[model samples]
Target: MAEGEITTLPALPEDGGSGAFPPGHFKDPKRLYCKNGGFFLRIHPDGRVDGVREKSDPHIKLQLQAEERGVVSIKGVSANRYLAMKEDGRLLASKSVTDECFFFERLESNNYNTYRSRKYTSWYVALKRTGQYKLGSKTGPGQKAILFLPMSAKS
Candidate 1:
């Protein structure tokens, strides 16, 4: 019927009991900031998966699409790019639904989380202290990131 038109998303809210995600988390853009690198993981419009030192950079925001529980695809808001941990071990964020873009987020004991590629489950999305994107191969046991916090994007 038109029950929903009357309307409230019961699953969305009430007493703020269980799900306490910010209003935008359901389907919105967010920035992944790495603590060690002191940078926000970003994708340049032309390509280049780099870490941005500025939180105000537009390229730092990305829309996350969950493929399923604990798994998501990072899409850049700038040029409709998808994140990738290259086969050669480099990182890039460009083009469409590349399989390597699917990263499963795992919570860590450090109050941080790491995103591991489903394509190369052994590897992870890591950042260096120098504000650089670390190759997935070297990050095989990458112990940090997605250890990167997913903060809501700038308004």
Candidate 2:
């Protein structure tokens, strides 16, 4: 009664790594318009950021840093300043890229996105209902004032 088959298939070796794909990259300028409020994020030469009601504002066109895809920095094409955050959550136009300039972007189910500081994970880029900058420390992802819909720049 030799009922057992001695032949066994050998297990395969090597697991595919996620690094098989290339690093993500993004280019071109875009407009970050507020989802709940009627304003566009505009960078100023005065090293400040604010919302402008005019979509055609020349200073409103900004570029997403071309480094990694999800972790990006917002740089204004006209003002040539990176949208950076201070340690205290105050927004400013940075002359050069810094740890505070990088932000981790996340999309919501409502088709809007939120930008959170990489150095300070809990801090977010948010706006007040009056078009004023809200301290990132006081902003939340679930807050309507923190939502932004990215608009393509054609002009």
Candidate 3:
């Protein structure tokens, strides 16, 4: 695991106008939309998800999916770069937009729920350049993980 990084379990959405996910947050599997107020979410191919940016055309493409309790990773402008973990500790299924980056820009953690989820605590990780990112530990199944950068789930 990398040092000097703050880690903690992702918090659940309160639904008190704080956790309410908007439409189009997880719309396309290839495109990740950028938010202005730091409000967003990531959904894996399996349907596990983080915060809610756009409810329309989500990755799941379904309405009322469970709020994934794990980390999330996002990229955009300086103020739009966002990455966060969910409190549930679940992994999403993601792939790289391109092979240039080692890290999986399109993100997805492992499993759905488990203590072994996520390599670090709090937020998993976020990056601007292209690279590979591993969210869980090497041992076990490496559950509850999220990848960024190249966007592939592979390390």
Candidate 4:
């Protein structure tokens, strides 16, 4: 159970706990992030954003979701950078992108899974089938974003 590494998640009672995810995973990819500052963006075949014990925020959830032409916004809030790396690899925070909010757009079957984890809470997204639409954002992956959001819904 390394940071951002979910290995033994429960089954969906239908997924058999180890069943192959739907085509949507390829479009969305299971992702998570905590309103308290802990986050993870797991690619498809990785793991679903489950095992959430509680809500990260009393006023908010651990994760959020939106459909095509949807607007993901992160108002003034406390956020931190998530240095992506496997436990086998060095785990460290990114010096560049830290302290900001993240938002995703144009969610689809390929990329819909998303999540958030707080001190003791977890959040996941459930984006319904949606396509091409105008989406806006102020953060992006790499140093350009204090709020880093990578392009997950890739082909």
Candidate 5:
């Protein structure tokens, strides 16, 4: 594989061999919906990631790259921007993947996933009611923003 290139893998084997998946293989590309805000995480063409309420929308669609272990890089399908983090704990839709853009997903008992920044271990990706993006700790109100579920899993 070339540097910075992501390889696609076949669907998970029915025999359950090792159960390991290549990057972007565990889940298909889909919309990430915030359970509390009732909004989908979107990346605009101009590189803005926010929470919006829209069903079956294409602009807000995102894909995951399981770069390593639990770490994954999130990219917007429409904008081609990667969800990156700033040192001050802010979320930015960046054009490329950096250490700041990597996130680790912790699967919860409720089947939701929490995206925590790899650069700042304590900071998590969160969305506000006003559609602002921020990085917050697990215990704060921002925790609600970290919980995401695939739109397809809804029904």
Candidate 6:
């Protein structure tokens, strides 16, 4: 398994393990950070997605909702906004579900996954060292971000 890739998930009873993940197969919640540095994706109350560095902060926690065709919607748990990518490559938090909110999770080597926009396969969600958001390519070396440390309900 690579660094940020989730190679093994908690097995369910059907798989002869523990009944961790229920029927929906919802992977544990987590916070996504930009591997480029110490920045995390945070949704502001005004519906803006920004990169923050405070590890203990709760605004960065996200709920990943699995969708069809390997797509997922990243919703901010506290802000109640969805991370969205504009056609021009800007990143923001949206109040309602939109085409730009869907990202196709593509597994890359080193356990990292690239989130490409479903509406525009060529665009990816990336962050700068300063915690700024940008749209990039799935294969771009600098655009690859790492997600770590699954967050449980108690966390």
The C-alpha stretches of model 1 lying farther than 4 A from their native spots are 1-24, 142-146
Per-residue lDDT of model 1, residues 1-155, tens digit only: 54311222213223453532324353867667787657878788877777877765666768887666777778887768887777888887668777788888776665465777887886777877677777766675525443777754333
For model 5, residues 49-130, the per-residue Cα lDDT tens digits are 6777764456765877676788777877778888777776556787777888787777776657777667787666777776
Model 5 residue 137 lDDT score: 40
Q: Model 6: runs farther than 4 Å from truth?
A: 1-27, 135-155
User: How big is the positional error of residue 30 in model 4, measured in Å on the Cα after superposition?
Assistant: 13
Clash list (residue pairs), candidate 6: 2-110, 2-111, 3-110, 5-111
lDDT per residue (tens digit) for residues 1-155 in model 6: 25333333332223442422333534656666566776866788887667887756667668888777576777887888888777676677877988888887766544455676678776566776667665454334444453323333331
lDDT of each: 0.68, 0.70, 0.29, 0.26, 0.65, 0.63
**Candidate with maximal lDDT:** 2
lDDT score, candidate 2, position 136: 76
Using TM-score as the yardstick, the better of models 3 and 4 is 4
Output candidate 5 Cα RMSD: 8.3
Candidate 6 weakest ten by summed lDDT: 4-13
N/CA/C clash count, model 5: 0
Better of 2 and 5 by lDDT: 2
On residues 40-146, what C-alpha lDDT tens digit does candidate 2 reach at each position?
78888898778878665668778776457577767887898888888887789877888778888876675577777788886778877677888777787567876
Q: What is the alpha-carbon lDDT for the whole of candidate 1?
A: 0.68
TM-scores for the candidates: 0.77, 0.78, 0.19, 0.20, 0.74, 0.72
lDDT of 1 at 126: 84
Model 6: residue 155 alpha-carbon error in angstroms = 6.9
Off by over 4 Å in 3: 1-21, 30-121, 127-130, 134-155
Candidate rank order under TM-score: 2, 1, 5, 6, 4, 3
- Backbone clash pairs for candidate 2 read none
Query: Which of the predicted structures, 3 or 5, would earn the higher TM-score when compared with the native?
Result: 5
